[PDB]
Motif scaffolding. Structure first.
Motif, PDB file in Angstrom:
ATOM      1  N   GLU A  65       1.045  -1.322   0.252  1.00 27.92           N
ATOM      2  CA  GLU A  65       0.052  -0.115  -0.105  1.00 27.92           C
ATOM      3  C   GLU A  65       0.786   1.271  -0.118  1.00 27.92           C
ATOM      4  O   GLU A  65       0.426   2.213  -0.776  1.00 27.92           O
ATOM      5  N   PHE A  66       1.938   1.137   0.797  1.00 27.07           N
ATOM      6  CA  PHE A  66       2.835   2.327   0.952  1.00 27.07           C
ATOM      7  C   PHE A  66       3.479   2.400  -0.344  1.00 27.07           C
ATOM      8  O   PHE A  66       3.601   3.870  -0.934  1.00 27.07           O
ATOM      9  N   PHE A  67       4.057   1.452  -0.859  1.00 27.13           N
ATOM     10  CA  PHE A  67       4.590   1.671  -2.318  1.00 27.13           C
ATOM     11  C   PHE A  67       3.595   2.287  -3.442  1.00 27.13           C
ATOM     12  O   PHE A  67       3.885   3.278  -4.064  1.00 27.13           O
ATOM     13  N   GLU A  68       2.490   1.706  -3.295  1.00 29.42           N
ATOM     14  CA  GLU A  68       1.418   1.998  -4.267  1.00 29.42           C
ATOM     15  C   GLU A  68       1.210   3.744  -4.227  1.00 29.42           C
ATOM     16  O   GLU A  68       1.137   4.377  -4.839  1.00 29.42           O
ATOM     17  N   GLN A  69       0.918   4.012  -2.812  1.00 32.38           N
ATOM     18  CA  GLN A  69       0.548   5.433  -2.517  1.00 32.38           C
ATOM     19  C   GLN A  69       1.641   6.494  -2.914  1.00 32.38           C
ATOM     20  O   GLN A  69       1.397   7.878  -3.111  1.00 32.38           O
ATOM     21  N   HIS A  70       3.096   5.731  -2.892  1.00 33.13           N
ATOM     22  CA  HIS A  70       4.096   6.870  -3.496  1.00 33.13           C
ATOM     23  C   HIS A  70       4.548   6.809  -4.639  1.00 33.13           C
ATOM     24  O   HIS A  70       5.387   7.178  -5.144  1.00 33.13           O
ATOM     25  N   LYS A  71       3.504   5.857  -5.820  1.00 39.24           N
ATOM     26  CA  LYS A  71       3.838   5.702  -7.066  1.00 39.24           C
ATOM     27  C   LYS A  71       5.319   5.025  -7.193  1.00 39.24           C
ATOM     28  O   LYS A  71       5.973   5.280  -8.200  1.00 39.24           O
ATOM     29  N   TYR A  72       5.501   4.038  -6.247  1.00 35.61           N
ATOM     30  CA  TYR A  72       6.949   3.342  -6.206  1.00 35.61           C
ATOM     31  C   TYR A  72       8.204   3.984  -6.452  1.00 35.61           C
ATOM     32  O   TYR A  72       9.162   3.985  -6.929  1.00 35.61           O
TER      33      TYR A  72
END
Ligand SMILES: CC(=O)N[C@H]1[C@@H](OP(=O)(O)O)O[C@H](CO)[C@@H](O)[C@@H]1O
Ligand SMILES: OCCc1ccc(O)cc1
Ligand SMILES: OCCc1ccc(O)cc1
Ligand SMILES: [Mg+2]
Length: 473
Positions: free
Chosen positions: A172-179
């Protein structure tokens, strides 16, 4: 759900194995709960659990010298021309799409006391960047530097190993930061496996009436997980030949460090590893050394306090054993291609633990006062003794440039958010100064997208920077 016949055959297996208590509450389970217990128990072999418990609870009943000089190296002792060459060679391997990173990010950070994965932690930098983001930007920057030499896309695939506790919030964190600006298609989040927790009497612990107490299988779980996840196959498809594996908690980690990769590749080792000088006898670090003619590590939780305090014969105020493991490893891809032949050979380390479970009678959820069982873990460095000395290298690096672990909650004094922040911002200031910047003022955060390791700061020559500062794009 599972058939009556399927369930009886599972029950027979476990009962014959002396583990039939796992079915004590089956008669009061809902359909869903019964299904979960069935599937979870089917995932373990109770005979193998007995094997593990037996070896752990009744273990079978010290040719221990510093690594010889043929297997060691030190940045401090290196010819700077060689350092430059190995850097250029490492960058050329990155440019060839031959370099992969494995991030070990399955730890629970129980000393840290955060509700989020450790990699999400904000150590209080001016940027408020997470450990994950700082690492991602180091990968991004090295790709950019590599593209300057190749004129082609450079990709360093990032394989992020998480545990059950960390996987969903990590993704979720990676997705929210657009990787963090990397391509999603080159970042893979996968899970390590688990092992059942075992009572002091050798019995499987039940977390609930329908669930076995499990824990992640240690960072040595990486190897089996690379196969089952598809990660090794993906590395093969991409033509990976060199892998950097490290721990998420090190805010200074030189991700895919080209000097390290270049040096390892040049020496054609199977395995290389970084160390720093142990800062005292009690530091919670594994020690890298020679055991029975073999490269090996003695973890801080298993060393006897006598070998930890063993003084150098020549220099009685210095420690004999001071090559502190900083969890920064290099592998050849060829090494990974043989995992199947030796993954089962890795030992299980034992830790005695308070494992919340069901009162074996009532069925009430109870937090034990004293250790009621054990957790088993495999350790990533227990491959070192499979490797000949001539295919192993152990390199000393500078702590202040390379190792600043986030182990403890703020307010400890050591290996915490404040030391991490200080070490990062001290690093930034030193780089700026070396490039001719004047920092007035503590320290300066330098974005990895500006500078990976001190390069590219010529633009600051003669400029005055008021600390604290943040240099970014
Ligand atoms: C199995 C493993 O990788 N253990 C490592 C690891 O210990 P932790 O128990 O995860 O804090 O990090 C240390 C450095 O912070 C290192 O010295 C030690 O050997
Ligand atoms: O592969 C893990 C096994 C497993 C299967 C089903 C569950 O509900 C829990 C664990
Ligand atoms: O001779 C040591 C060269 C060396 C320096 C730093 C590294 O990270 C790796 C290798
Ligand atoms: Mg992906």
């Amino acid at each position: 759900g599972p058939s009556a016949e399927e369930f009886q055959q599972l029950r027979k297996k476990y009962t014959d194995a002396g583990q039939g208590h796992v079915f004590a509450f089956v008669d009061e389970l809902q359909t869903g709960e019964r299904s979960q217990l069935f599937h979870q128990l089917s995932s373990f072999d109770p005979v193998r659990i007995n094997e593990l418990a037996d070896k752990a609870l009744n273990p079978p009943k010290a040719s221990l010298e510093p690594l010889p000089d043929i297997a060691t190296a030190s940045i401090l002792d290196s010819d700077p021309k060689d350092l430059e060459q190995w850097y250029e060679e490492g960058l050329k391997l990155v440019a060839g799409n031959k370099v992969a990173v494995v991030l070990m990010a399955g730890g629970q950070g129980t000393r840290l006391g955060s509700s989020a994965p450790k990699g999400c932690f904000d150590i209080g930098l001016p940027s408020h960047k997470s450990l994950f983001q700082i690492q991602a930007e180091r990968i991004a920057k090295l790709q950019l530097l590599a593209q300057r030499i190749s004129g082609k896309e450079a990709v360093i695939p990032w394989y992020v190993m998480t545990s059950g506790p960390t996987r969903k919030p990590t993704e979720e964190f990676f997705e929210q930061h657009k990787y963090f600006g990397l391509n999603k298609s080159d970042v893979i989040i996968f899970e390590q496996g688990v092992l059942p927790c075992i009572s002091n009497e050798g019995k499987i612990l039940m977390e609930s009436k329908f669930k076995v107490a499990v824990a992640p299988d240690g960072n040595g779980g990486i190897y089996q997980a690379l196969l089952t996840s598809g990660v090794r196959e993906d590395m093969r498809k991409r033509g990976i030949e060199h892998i950097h594996t490290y721990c998420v908690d090190n805010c200074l980690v030189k991700v895919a460090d080209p000097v390290f990769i270049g040096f390892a590749a040049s020496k054609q080792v199977d395995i290389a590893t970084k160390v720093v000088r142990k800062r005292n006898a009690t530091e919670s670090v594994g020690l890298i050394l020679q055991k029975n003619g073999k490269p090996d590590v003695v973890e801080y939780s298993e060393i006897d306090k006598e070998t930890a305090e063993a003084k150098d014969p020549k220099q009685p105020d210095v420690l004999k054993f001071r090559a502190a493991n900083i969890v920064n490893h290099y592998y050849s891809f060829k090494f990974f291609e043989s995992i199947e032949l030796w993954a089962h050979k890795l030992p299980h380390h034992v830790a005695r633990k308070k494992i919340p479970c069901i009162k074996e009678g009532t069925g009430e959820f109870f937090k034990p006062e004293k250790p009621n069982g054990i957790k088993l873990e495999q350790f990533v460095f227990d491959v070192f003794p499979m490797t000949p000395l001539e295919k192993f290298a152990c390199i000393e690096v500078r702590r202040e440039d390379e190792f600043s672990p986030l182990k403890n909650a703020r307010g400890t004094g050591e290996d915490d958010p404040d030391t991490s922040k200080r070490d990062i911002m001290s690093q930034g200031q030193r780089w700026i100064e070396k490039a001719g910047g004047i920092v007035i003022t503590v320290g300066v955060e330098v974005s990895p997208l500006i500078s990976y390791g001190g390069e590219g700061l010529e633009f600051l020559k003669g400029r005055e920077i008021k600390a604290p500062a943040f240099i970014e794009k």
